[PDB]
Design a binder for this molecule. Structure first.
Ligand SMILES: [Ca+2]
Ligand SMILES: [Se]
Ligand SMILES: [Se]
Lengths: 197, 189, 198
């Protein structure tokens, strides 16, 4: 509720980017208590949907799902300041995020190549914002639509956080070594170098 | 194979101290034997039943209990209208699915490592002869409707024996909190 | 290109595929969630037949795939095993390296899979096998959990040698199945399908 009202205030205000203003087109009641769809806009084009769960605490923690990205706008949106502002905004209201990566070719390619989720273009954006636990879902559309998502979470403790980063170091070490293309290696090196501060 | 028997019981509703349960809508699902029964507690919509009537060498009957109105959670989960509905489904379906998301007790127990059969909701299913349990806990961010218990009647007296040996083992692999005494009193069968 | 493929699909589906069961036609198209994704509603004669979810490809990122699902329940005993079903898959195999076929309404395949026949030597999967598909998966996810989880998933192999290796494996599975089964009628059927494969 406190959370509900501040998601609406920011969104109804609009989020400013160099790609256009991101606006709430329409809000929608979900399956459950505390669950809403927010249909978003970028400069008068449809952008994407946010599936929001506000929390029913001890039982269910809050989460956002970012999906339904307008393929006409994939090349405007991915790697943009609009996307940064979006994830920043959601970062301040959610400890768990799912982003659909299907329309994001760079992240797609990097995951297919074995890049750790946190060090993929999209994963890395979430990493910068404090999400430290990563799961890559790659289920065939064909079987079930909507199963190419990164799930990311903030560490519960300074202990879980340390464990998440130790695993990331291992995963990175395994990638170097498996990787055959020096350009992909340099890009992953430089994301990992960021983290190391 | 019998809706008709399911239909006769459903309009001209179901008893219960929390209000009557009655039919509202009714459709034809993806497959010839699949249907959706919309239900009410009083005038409020309650819940949806997805029934599958069987195609019996190939597919066995099952009912799914989902789409439960959040304004009734605290009234329905725990209630005798819940039991009267299960009780009634237990007479017609050897396999049942119930979404436990709105059920804050079942949820909290499952998350504690309680075996599905000894959780609030699952225990209610154990009474009615369901002996095989599966807890599905799939993030809604991935896929909607993946928080459900799957419960199954034994095909055979020997299948029952086996499911009950698994339950004893899950009971023990759990006492390895204070709600322990709650699970303990549930297993005393 | 996703567009050449697209245009080839419409042309032969709108011309129609002739069968003794009737002409299979494309009667409706809708854009899916991704740009190269469509639902192609198909009729048999004048009755709805099924839906093809087509994914045209966005190579190298995503390979093309076709999902055949939503078989008209009152056409199941007409479609499965027909010349129509064969001519449909045959068309699909000329355009997609990966296929998904919903087997829920196909009781023979359902029955065979349950008795542990390898997916490739079931009635449905064998039909895909004959067309070049070599990697097989049997999905059997309960419908009360998630609609759409009784599918065969099959893929064309990348090379002739990978193709030779998965077939050796199908053989082990076949011989493993054939000495683990009663129902000599099933065994006779699976054996025919396997002898053919040479
Ligand atoms: Ca082609
Ligand atoms: Se019926
Ligand atoms: Se029916």
């Amino acid at each position: 509720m406190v959370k509900y009202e501040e998601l609406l205030k920011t969104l109804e205000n609009g989020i400013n980017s160099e790609e256009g203003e991101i606006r709430l087109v329409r809000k929608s009641q979900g399956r459950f208590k505390e669950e809403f769809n927010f249909d978003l806009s970028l400069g008068s084009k449809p952008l994407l949907t946010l599936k929001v769960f506000l929390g029913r605490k001890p039982y269910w923690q809050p989460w956002v799902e970012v999906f339904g990205v307008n393929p006409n706008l994939r090349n405007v949106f991915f790697g943009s300041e609009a996307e940064r502002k979006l994830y920043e905004f959601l970062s301040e209201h959610f400890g768990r995020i799912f982003v659909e990566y299907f329309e994001d070719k760079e992240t797609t390619y990097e995951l297919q190549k074995g890049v750790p989720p946190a060090l993929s273009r999209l994963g890395f954006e979430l990493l910068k914002l404090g999400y430290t636990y990563f799961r890559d879902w790659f289920i065939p559309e064909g079987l079930m639509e909507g199963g190419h998502k990164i799930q990311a979470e903030k560490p519960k403790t300074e202990e879980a956080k340390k464990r998440h980063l130790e695993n990331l170091k291992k995963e990175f070490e395994e990638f170097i070594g498996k990787c055959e293309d020096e350009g992909l290696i340099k890009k992953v090196k430089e994301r990992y170098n960021f983290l190391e501060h």
